[PDB]
Design a binder for this molecule. Structure first.
Ligand SMILES: N[C@@H](CCC(=O)O)C(=O)O
Length: 502
């Protein structure tokens, strides 16, 4: 039995982190076992359809590097991979289940069901269509066969419901959650086929998991209360159920409850892998991608929300995750999201990149800001800035003094770094460096020689010099800054500082 898993999102909007993590654990489990990773688009509910969802899903999976072996876009041996295109399949299996005792016809109109729901509510009760109520309602169990024929002949709309067994203990086994039991008298007669012949999610999914030879169903815990019904649908069809693994919801950074988009808005962190623009507002929610997260760092971060790399390394690549991943070690306890941790991962991955690997994106940033520098200087600037960077764009945004002279000087910094003797000192410094081979270490030695001839610590020259070149006391070491911007730009900035601050 070749392992086969499917990511089965409905097209109802952008992928949340929980959905990315489910797709990832699908992919890892499949690849770890030499099996197949299927994408099935679960679009049976036409009214909940969100335009652009399916494109977003393909694009996010491609960005992260987990392309489905089978999908609507790519094809595969169980095409069509959109459920809206599988109606003939569901039609034939509907006929099959109606030959059993597990399904029946229900003619109740939505107004009739609204009425009985309101009667229960008024009493403090919740109406369920189940073993206790089905005999007072309008269906093929409660109505004589000749009346059912009459209704059918008149084209009376109906749904198909599952007939829950009476008082039956269903013993279930989940890879994550372990063993537990459900009595069917807690469950209702769920709708399996809507009144247009389209299956509901529950029926379409056991039909398609059976037809697509799925061996392991990995999904979120919101589906756990449905597992008993799904096992009983396999039983009704004469089929063996796959194995199940239910993932606990990602928790808020702080306080009780699940992570939501409202948290990311409220605290300033992205919630979707890629940009997405809401139709109903025109608003665009920026993705991790567009904010500068590397996909390798993003997916490493998502992987850790419930899985501990068996080798104890925090930093792990896609291919090492494939080799290491054990679905049996995925934790049942919920994992808290951490925006700081996501930034930490990006910073860690950025340090592991060579200056050359950063250089293409750095040049794109430089171009967007209308600046140019030689490849050789850009690589040195990347080297000098990358340790303190989280995103490639930080190398420019926090390093603007490499490309732009200061137009003013921070008042606090000026009081600290610039004294009534500083002007004369900086002009002497200009005279010293004007004849140098303008290399960092040579510059540093020349500054040291001026300091010791004047009886000063290094800081007495370096601090006003940094202020002169940067406009505040930020940046990397002054001699390397000077080498990058060059002799002419260095002197020109010392001159402007003298003219401004003496
Ligand atoms: N369409 C369902 C699929 C659940 C499953 O994997 O069975 C969802 O979006 O959650």
């Amino acid at each position: 039995e070749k392992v086969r898993v499917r990511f089965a999102p409905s097209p109802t909007g952008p992928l949340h982190l929980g959905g990315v993590r489910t797709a990832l654990y699908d992919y890892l489990f499949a690849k770890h076992n030499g099996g197949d990773f299927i994408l099935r688009i679960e679009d049976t509910d036409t009214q909940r359809y969100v335009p652009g969802s399916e494109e977003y899903i393909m694009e996010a999976l491609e960005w992260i590097g987990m392309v489905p072996d089978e999908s609507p876009k790519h094809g595969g041996p169980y095409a069509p991979y959109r459920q809206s295109e599988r109606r003939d399949i569901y039609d034939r299996y509907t006929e099959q289940i109606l030959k059993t005792d597990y399904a029946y016809l229900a003619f109740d109109t939505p107004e009739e069901l609204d009425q009985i729901r309101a009667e229960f509510e008024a009493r403090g009760d919740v109406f369920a269509y189940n073993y206790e109520t089905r005999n007072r309602l309008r269906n093929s169990i409660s109505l004589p066969e000749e009346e059912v024929k009459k209704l059918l002949e008149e084209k009376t709309p109906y749904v198909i419901r599952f007939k829950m067994p009476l008082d039956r203990i269903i013993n279930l086994n989940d890879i994550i959650r372990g063993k537990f039991s459900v009595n069917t008298n807690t469950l209702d007669d769920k709708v399996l086929v809507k009144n247009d012949g389209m299956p509901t999610y529950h029926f379409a999914n056991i039909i398609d998991d059976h037809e697509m030879k799925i061996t392991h169903v990995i999904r979120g815990e919101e589906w756990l209360p449905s597992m008993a019904l799904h096992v009983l649908l396999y039983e009704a069809m004469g089929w063996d159920a796959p194995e199940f693994a239910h993932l606990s919801l990602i928790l808020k950074p702080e306080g009780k409850g699940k992570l939501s988009k409202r948290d990311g808005d409220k605290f300033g962190f992205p919630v979707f892998p890629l940009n997405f623009t809401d139709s109903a507002t025109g608003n665009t929610s920026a993705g991790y991608r567009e904010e500068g997260y590397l996909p390798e760092a993003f997916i490493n971060m998502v992987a850790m929300l419930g899985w501990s790399p068996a080798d104890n390394k925090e930093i792990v690549s896609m291919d090492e995750m494939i080799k290491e991943f054990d679905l049996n070690k995925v934790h049942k306890a919920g994992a808290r999201f951490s925006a700081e941790k996501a930034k930490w991962f990006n910073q860690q991955y950025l340090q592991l990149m060579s200056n050359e690997a950063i250089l293409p994106e750095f040049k794109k940033v430089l171009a967007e800001n209308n600046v140019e520098v030689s490849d050789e200087k850009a690589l040195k600037i990347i080297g000098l800035m990358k340790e303190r960077a989280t995103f490639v764009k930080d190398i420019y945004n926090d390093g603007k003094f490499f490309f732009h002279a200061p137009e003013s000087f921070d008042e606090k910094a000026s009081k600290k770094a610039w004294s009534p003797e500083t002007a004369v000192l900086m002009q002497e410094l200009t005279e010293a460096i004007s004849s140098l081979d303008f290399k960092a270490e040579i510059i540093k030695e020349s500054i040291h020689h001026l300091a010791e001839a004047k009886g000063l610590g290094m800081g007495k020259v370096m601090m006003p010099l940094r202020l002169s070149l940067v406009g505040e006391l930020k940046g990397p070491d002054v001699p390397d800054l000077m080498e990058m911007i060059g002799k002419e730009e260095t002197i020109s900035r010392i001159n402007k500082a003298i003219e401004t601050l003496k």
